[PDB]
Structure formats: C-alpha cells, structure tokens
Design a protein around this ligand. Sequence first.
Ligand SMILES: [Mg+2]
Ligand SMILES: [Zn+2]
Ligand SMILES: [Zn+2]
Lengths: 86, 55, 166, 122, 97, 39, 199, 76, 512
Amino acid sequence: LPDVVLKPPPLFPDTDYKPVPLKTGEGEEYMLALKQELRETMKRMPYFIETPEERQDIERYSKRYMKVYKEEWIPDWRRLPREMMP
Amino acid sequence: RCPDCGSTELVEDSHYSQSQLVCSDCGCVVTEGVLTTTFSDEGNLREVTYSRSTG
Amino acid sequence: FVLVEMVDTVRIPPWQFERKLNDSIAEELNKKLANKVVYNVGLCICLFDITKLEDAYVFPGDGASHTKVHFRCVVFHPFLDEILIGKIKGCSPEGVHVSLGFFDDILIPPESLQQPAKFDEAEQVWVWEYGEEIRFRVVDESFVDTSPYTLVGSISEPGLGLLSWW
Amino acid sequence: MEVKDANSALLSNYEVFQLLTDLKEQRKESGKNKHSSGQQNLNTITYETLKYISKTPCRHQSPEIVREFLTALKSHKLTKAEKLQLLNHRPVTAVEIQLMVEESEERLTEEQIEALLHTVTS
Amino acid sequence: TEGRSRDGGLRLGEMERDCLIGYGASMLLLERLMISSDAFEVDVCGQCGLLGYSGWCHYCKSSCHVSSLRIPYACKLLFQELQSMNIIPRLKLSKYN
Amino acid sequence: GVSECIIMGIPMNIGTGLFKLLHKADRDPNPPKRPLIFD
Amino acid sequence: QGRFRGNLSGKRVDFSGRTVISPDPNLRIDEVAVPVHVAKILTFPEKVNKANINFLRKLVQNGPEVHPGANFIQQRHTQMKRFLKYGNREKMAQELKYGDIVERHLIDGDVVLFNRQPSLHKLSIMAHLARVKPHRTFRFNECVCTPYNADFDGDEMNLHLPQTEEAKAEALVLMGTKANLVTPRNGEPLIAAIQDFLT
Amino acid sequence: RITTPYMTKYERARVLGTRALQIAMCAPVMVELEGETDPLLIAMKELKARKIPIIIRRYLPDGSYEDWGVDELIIT
Amino acid sequence: TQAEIKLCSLLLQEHFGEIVEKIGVHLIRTGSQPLRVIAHDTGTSLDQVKKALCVLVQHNLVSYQVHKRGVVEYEAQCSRVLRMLRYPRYIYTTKTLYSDTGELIVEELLLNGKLTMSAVVKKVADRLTETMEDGKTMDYAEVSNTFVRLADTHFVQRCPSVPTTENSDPGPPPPAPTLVINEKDMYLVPKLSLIGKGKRRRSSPIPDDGIYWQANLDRFHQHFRDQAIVSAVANRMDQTSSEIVRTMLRMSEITTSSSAPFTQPLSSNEIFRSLPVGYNISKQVLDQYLTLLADDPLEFVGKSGDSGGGMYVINLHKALASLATATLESVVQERFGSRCARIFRLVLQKKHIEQKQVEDFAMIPAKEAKDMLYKMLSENFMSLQEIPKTPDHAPSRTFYLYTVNILSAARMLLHRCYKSIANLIERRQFETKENKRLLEKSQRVEAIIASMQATGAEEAQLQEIEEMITAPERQQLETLKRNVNKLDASEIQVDETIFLLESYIECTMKRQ
Ligand SMILES: [Mg+2]
Ligand SMILES: [Zn+2]
Ligand SMILES: [Zn+2]
C-alpha cells in the first residue's frame, strides 16, 4: 500500500544535477557586449517603432525643451507595392 | 441557539411538509429546508460497506 | 488629483421616482464610489459632473430603473513626480509610516535614501537630524479578494535640502 | 466600471475645495437619514479632506486668481506640474522654489524667483 | 419530490409550457420554471467566459470582469457536468440594453 | 431560441419579451457642465 | 430519466395544488372557488408598501390559523424569516416597515392559474380570480368546462399560484378567461352554454 | 411611427405588470386611490387614467426602434 | 509550432515593436493572407498594417504573392524570423574570417535587410570613422574590396531583382512589382567608381539603383556545419585529420550545393597540394589518414572510387545524423545520468531489443534499468513496437520491442529548445521590467556625466554621481546585469544546439 500524501508534492522538486557553467573566454564576452550594444542600436534606429505616448493632459512651453529627435528612414518604393504608401 | 436573544430553546416542528428549526422565544427561524434522497435515486445508487471500502 | 471619465450603469429603486433623475443618479454614484480605490486607477473621492445620461431601461426582474451614465469624478493618483505634504503617523523600523493629512495612512516610505544617518531604532524616530514632504515613486494595485492594502505606493525622500526643517 | 482616462486632466486643489464645499452645503441641505446611514464613507472623506484643504492656504483663491496665476507662469515656460504644486502649496519663501521645488538647475535664473514669489502672494 | 407520498409539487409537462409559449407569457413562464422550481446565483467572468464564485474568477485569477446572473440550478448542473467531460462551456455575456 | 432561453433561464423574445420598456422619468440628458479653470 | 429529456424539457414546481373538480354555477366565468384548506397553504409574497400597510397589519394579526392571515414575514434589511405561529403577532405587526415581504394567505381576487393534466390546446390552462369557500373541492362555472374538457367524473385539477406581480398581471391579461372566449384555431367561441343551460 | 397606433395586449400586460411591481415597492401614485389595496387594481386605474410614466420602445427586426408614450397609444 | 510562434512573437516584440509583431504573429498563425483581411482581423488601421508590412518585407521576414484576380496575399517566414537570433554568431564568424569591416558590413545588412553598394559602403565607412581617431579617414576602396570579397564568398547575395516592367506588360501596373530572383547576379558586384570619406558626425544620381544585397545565411549555415564537423573530427581522431576534412570542404564550398547528400569527388593528390604548408605531412601519411578515416566507424568520409590515387567523398547526411545523435546522447546523459546514457547508446546500436536483453548487455540489475527505460520512454525519446502474435494487437499476448528513432527525438528536442529560449527571454524581460526604476536611475546618473561631459563638466559633480541613492542598489543592478549576461550567453549557447538539430531536420527532408 503506497503511503497517502498528506501534503502535496512541492512546487519545485529539488534536482540532483546542476547546470553546467557557461563558456569562458574573450569570444563570449565579446558576444555579450556586442548583443547588449546591439540592443541599444536597434532601440535608437528608426526601424524601432516607438509606442505612441498617451495620457498627457495639458499644454506648456516646456514641451519644446524636452523634445527627443531622430531621423526617419524611407523604404525603396520600387521594390515595395504601391498599396503600402502612407 | 438564537443569534439575537441567545436562547438555546430551538425546537424541531413539522410545518406543511417542511422541516425547519425555529426559536420558541422570538419565533425566528435559524435553519430551514432539508435534503433527502428520493426513491428513484435510492433504487439506482448502490450501498457500500466499510470492509469492501477499506479493502 | 485628476478627473476620470467614468462610465457605469446605475440602478435606481422606484421609491425615488418623484425626484429628478440626475440628482438621484449623483447621490447613488457618490454612495457607490466613496473611499473605494479602483484597480489601476487610484482612490476615487467624489463625483464632479455628469456628461451623458441616456434612456432609463426597466428590466423584467427587479422592476426598478437602470440608466447608463457617462460622467467625471475626481481620484487621487500621483504621476510618480508629485510633491506631497503628509504627517508621520507611525514609523516602523524597516520603514516610516507617513499619512497624508486626513487622507489615508497607507503611503509607506521605506527609509532607504535620506542623508546617510538612516536608521529607525523603534522608539519612534522621525528622522536622524543633521509636516513632512514627499516625492512619490510608484503606484501599485491588487485584488484583495483572494479569500471568500491594494494601494500603497513607494515613497522616497532624497536630499531635498529641507532648509525649513533641517 | 470601465475608466476611459486615468489621467484625463489634472485639476488644482482649489477646484477640489470648491466642489467639496458645494457638495457639503448641498448634502446638509439635502439631509436624508437612510442614504447617509447606508454609507458614512462619503461624509467622512468629504469632511476630512475639506478640513485638510482648509488647513492649507488653498482658500482665498478665485477662478480669476488662478487663471491670472497660470497666465503669468506661462511666460515663465515652467513645467505645469511644478506650478500646480506651487499653487497647491503657496510658496512665498524663496527657499522652497530654490531647494524644495525641483528643476532648480538652469531654471530659477536667480531673478525669476522674486517674480515667482510675487505671483504666489497674488 | 415526486408526489403526495413524497410531498411533491405538480409537474409542468411539456404541453403546459407549450401553451404558455403560445400565450406569450414570457415573464410568467420564466418565473414559474426558474424562480418557483430552482433559482441560483452565478458569477461569470467576461474575459474568460467561465463561471466564477463570490464575484471572483479563479481561471483568470481576477475579479475585474465578474457579474451576477440568475440561473436554473439544473442549468448550472448541466454546465458543470459538461465541464467534467472537458467540453468547457465559455459564456459570452452581452449587455441588456 | 425559446428552448435554450428556458434552458438558460432568460426571458424569451417572443411575446412580452419582444419590446423594451423605458421609464418616463424627469431627466435632462447632457446636463450643463461645470467648466475647469486650470485647463 | 437523464438530464436532457428529464429535467431540462420539463420540471416539477412548488406552490401548486391538485384537487377533485366540482361544479358551481353561482360563480362568474372568470372566478374559481378555492377550498380554505388549500388557501391556508398557498401563500403569495406581498411587498409591504404605503397603500396596503393596514391590510397586511390586520392579516398578520389574524395569524396562520385564521384564513385571512400570513405564514411568514421577511424583513427588508435582514433575510431572517419569521414564522407567525410563535411570538406576539401584534408587536410583529407594529414592527412592519415598507419594503418588507409578507407571505399572506391566498385571498379573494388573487390571480391563480388553473389547468388540466391532458393539455391539447392553449385553453387547457387559464387564469382566474380566486374566491375562497369552506368546502374541499375546486369549483367554478360550468360554462368553462368545454375548454378544459373536464366533466366532473372524479377528475383532478391542477392549480398554480404565481409569485410575481409581473407574472400575476401577465396571467390576468393574457390567460384571463374573459380574454380567451374564442379558440385560436378558427375563432369559434369555446366558452358558451352547456347541458342543463341550453335546455 | 409606421407601426400600429393601437396598443396591443402584450404591451398592456407588460406595462401593467411593471407598473404594479413598481407601485408594490412604494412608488409614487398619480391616480389618488380610494382604498384599493391590490396593486393591479391601481395599475389598471392608472392605465384607464392614462397617467402611467412608461414609454414603449418598439423594436424593428433590423435594430431600428421607435418610441411611443402610453398616452400616445390607443387603448381598448 | 506553438512554442515557435511564442518565441517569434517575443523576438519581434523585442527587435522591431508591437504593431509589427502583431501582424507578424497573425501571418505566422494564418499563413497566406490578403492585406485587407489582415487589417480587419488584427483590429489595426490600414496605415499601421502598411508600416508593419514594409518594415517586415524590407528585412525579408515576409513576402507577398499574386493570385486570381490580381490579389496580393502576404506570407510569413517563421524560420527567417528565428534566424535573427543567430545574427551575433554570424557577426562573430565574419569577424573571425575577415576584418571588422566585413563584420560591420554583415551587421548593417542584418539590421537593414537589403542595401545597395552605395548605401552599404557609406554606412560601413561612417561606422568605421568613429572607431578611429587622430584625423585618419576611411576610403570607399577598402570597404568595396571587403564587400566584393564577401559577396564572392557567397556570404552576401543579391535580392530578388525587380523585373523590367517596360519589357513585359507595359501599361496597367500590377498591384505588386512581383520581384524575381536571378541566380547569375546574386554575386555580380557592380562597380562604385566614386571614393570618399565618411563624416565623423560633427552635426554642424544613385549609380546602384534597383540592386539590393542581403546576408546569405545559407552560406553561414554551411560554414557552421563545416566548423561543427571539423570540431567533431578533431575531438575524435586527430587535428590533422580535421584539417584535411576542413581543406576538402573548403575545396567543395563553392563546387557543391547547400543541399547535397555527398560532396564532390576529391582525390588525395590535389588534397596534398591544397593543404597549407604549415602542416608538415607526406603523401603516404595523407593516404594512411584518409584510409583510416574511411575505416572510422563514424564514416564521415568515403572512397567512392580508386581513380586519381586516393579519391574521397564526405557524407553530409551521415555526419549530420552522427552529430545529432552525439548531442542527443550528451543531453540525455546530463539530465538522466551516465547509466541511462549507457542504455541510450546501447539501444542506439541495437535498433530492436527486449528489456531483459538491455539489462544483460548494459549490466544493470533489475528495478534500476527498467525505471530508466520507463522514464526515457515517457519523455517521448523512446518508442515501442508492440509486435503481436495474432492481429488483435491487444493484451498480454504480444512482444514489446524497444526502438528509438533519431528524427522524432530531434524534432521534440528542437521544440524543447524553442520553449527553453522562450522561457529565458521571458525571465530576462520580466527581470528588466521589474527593475526599470533602477534602470532609469542608472541612466540618469550616467546622463549627468554624458550630458555636458566636456563643456562645463566640473569635477565637483563627479563625486555627486555616487550621491544618488543607487549606491547599495548598484549591487542589485550588478546581480541583474550578470544574470542578464548569463541568460543571454546561455541562450546563445543553446542557439548553437538548435543549428545542429534543425540542420538534420533540414537534411533529412527533401521537400518533393
Ligand atoms: Mg373525466
Ligand atoms: Zn429570538
Ligand atoms: Zn475569467
């Protein structure tokens, strides 16, 4: 007769095997730094569609002093169908 | 017991085919309605004994 | 504070039919959202105005009136930068307990950023000196009905100078 | 139950005080025992917040007063949050806008503070 | 229950409901077959479409879309029985207006 | 359908359940609005 | 015996009755005689309002042992039911407030559904104004037997009592006997004279 | 306004029922009742007096509606 | 593909935005769809749909097709969406193969999808200008040389070309240009005569129009397969043998299609001359190496003929299957254990086997091996045949033969890797979001330095950078960072594993 379970199995059963330590070297750190810098570069690039800011109420002159500016790229419309023009 | 007056004089009396508990002091009902098995169901369900249940 | 565009259906019992509909709507709405925080919205206070008041339906059930109403009411919900001036009603060692004047004793500043003499040693110490103001950090809401709170926010007091009181 | 805008439009504490006084006088003019007995919470919040506001210098303002204050501050190109907080606190002492209030760097200009306090007194 | 030997009330046979429909007494029919036979109160989360309790939704782990609804107890029993068979009934509520 | 309406315990559309009632109360839709000064 | 064919298509209800049928020509064709014993059992929950406060007070004063009385009282605020067999009913009547629920006995003028077990056309079930009588059987005017197809040969006659003002008015207006003189099949009047009246 | 100008029996039944339910909840009365304790008697008294503050909202199948006051409708 | 869709949604939300990822997910889930139904079903405006479609097709993540009545139906490329995860590895392998100029070339191609000669050389020169100082200038000459070298190595290929609308159907324009791909100009680099220098961002007509160039990730995957194969060979037999395999694969890089069961026939005589002079070897030693690699049970290489001395061929499909089996045995060993790995390899060698045979051959007693068999069966790695003695195939009256299939286990393991990467991205994004307050705090403390960094930057504020309350909070930040770092690196490592399994899944599939 299997014993009746008085308290359910834990949300996490502890594991006997541990994860292997990751790779070490100049290549891995270069990988990581490259990926992290890529994160910001793709954030800054115009291909990153910024979400529309909202829930701002009233007007002021200070709006003109905290303006964030960035250039806007354009696609090649001869490769793109004409239907998708803004 | 009576929730308001605290009187423990709760008596069981049969109404027009309704089982309920009413306090004789304040005539306030503390528990009404009862659930009983019907013959159509008692004939289908099967009774179980302690021995066969425990194995 | 801030106005919120609030939309709700209000049920008016028939025994108030003699009164004007708008006034009964306002009274019921005031009774209905008083001292009651709204999840991800803030602490509602009182009704401001009633914008839209459409037809009053009657249902085959209760038999009273139901009117869908668009309106505006004021709530408390800082914008993570607002300056507050509250009173210290208690101070736990892990964090002081400030209360806005007669408003709510639910804003808990964890004492972690004032001048580097930070310790509340449980004999009710306001501050370690070299009617208390507040810069509000964040807001948070939760559903308390986890069993058949919810607006606290973190509060920070940096080196504002505070020449009036050290 | 749905809310369209949690930040539709910020309002000054003067409008809050005005609406609260109007609600108080109407409610005492519309004294009903049943509805008040059902929910005291509206009475408590109204009375407590009204007392809290009246303790502050939030009284003795008018729509003309606050509108002229806003127009005067508009030339000063200050952020609306800080000017609202000023009208919420009435800073007559220079130190509050100097240190207590934010955006002190590059914005006080060490000459606009006097006019700021003058407008506050108004 | 069944009858006099079991202190049971009368039975609205299908024909009686047919006559009631023919008259068009919608509210009378609803009251007779729901209020006077088996009335129950249920909570439905508009997001999940699933039943809830005490104005709470376990499946959605929330209470921001609950609502009250009167129901026949037999209907709720049928819903739960169908749930047991993994045929989950998702109720899509609509405003009365 | 009526069958499920009885099953679902909701009023049927046929008969008295067709039209909606409206309580003729003294009301002023779109009442005058208290203007905000700060905005 | 399953759910679908057993309890979903049709189901049993309470607040009903079944009694032997018997004629009574001294009643209007929209009226039905109800035995007192059934009247003392069937109760209609009346909401205590400004119009009928004194009426409900008197009915409560009568008690359950007298016919124009009540069996239960439900308070507006708390949902405790007060059974009128015990406790001074005069204090209880003086304790009445508007919005309370009083389960008064079936009294004169209450709209009551009246039906026969074999149902063929819609006139098999109607609504009548109930008048209480000291005898034991359901009585009504015989000019109404033709829609019911009853013949006073020991037949049993089902009685239903609505518990809602909306339902009560629906029964009175739609299935009122005066409103269903003609069958919908061909507009021929079903309620008319019968044997010993034509003669 | 193209539907029937007569006030059908279903409309009468539902209006009378809702009015009786309302007055049963201590709703205001406009027909100065003289000792009529039954709500429905007061309801049809109101209907005869044509002083019922209820507006029928007839619905066409498409969704379009039209509103008729009880006084505007012709009772039989 | 539910895990694939989830991971693709996470990646698209991370890299491009929200309205774009909604449309991408809808296309992935629905396949080919016209634009109007896309806008209607997604609940989005027409203009936002246009924006998402253009930013997607510019990077060649989605395409369009023409159908009856000239309708334009858009389709998504879920594999292409997963491909952006391997961008850092592509950058690393380009940086190793060639100078950082080619690294920036491929990086800009990935971040721009397709670029012309002028655009790519201008961008690369500009980005190379800031990497240096002292007034030196980059010229378009070296950038052009590196780009043409990359294209000739087939790492960069031309976009499908816009067909000549004047030559075919002059008149009513089709709704879409209907681009076509031409094999012979995928590497035909046009000349840019003009040479100049990129601006160093002081902040104070087109000779190459119609031709666009994109990273040829097929070349990257072929080179990565080469690297994996030579790494395995070096691990097993000898470094020199792996060098020989790498040399012959390099010989066959351009001569063989990306999808080939076998490589070209290569003889040891030309292998000797093609070998770098650094490896001091003799002809007979080369012959012995090649013969023993042909005798290697891993059967990476094969003779396929005795002409031209020792002529040899490599087994692409066999080598990929061997690599997949090695990865499978490694992961099952790491998660279950050494003895369960022994059982797995034993059943790998013996395709059909009974349970007691496994016990006897692996020398594992009862109640221990059988639990491993039951577990590794329940994890869908293992299959049972249920050979019956009758044809009712029913109760205790049939034999059960253990049989493990490489393909199914590889497929499910690929799904598991997808879900694992989804979990890692979810955890990193959740930890980033819950600490965005400290993120903005650190951003502000570094902005105090960066903004007004040389103009009026007093030293008397350098000591005020730590004055902000992040002094203990940086601790948390550091932990977050390393955790973030760890997660990213771990995810990248797992990505390589996917390239293994998918490669097998790609090579085992012919798509007739
Ligand atoms: Mg008979
Ligand atoms: Zn009591
Ligand atoms: Zn839910």
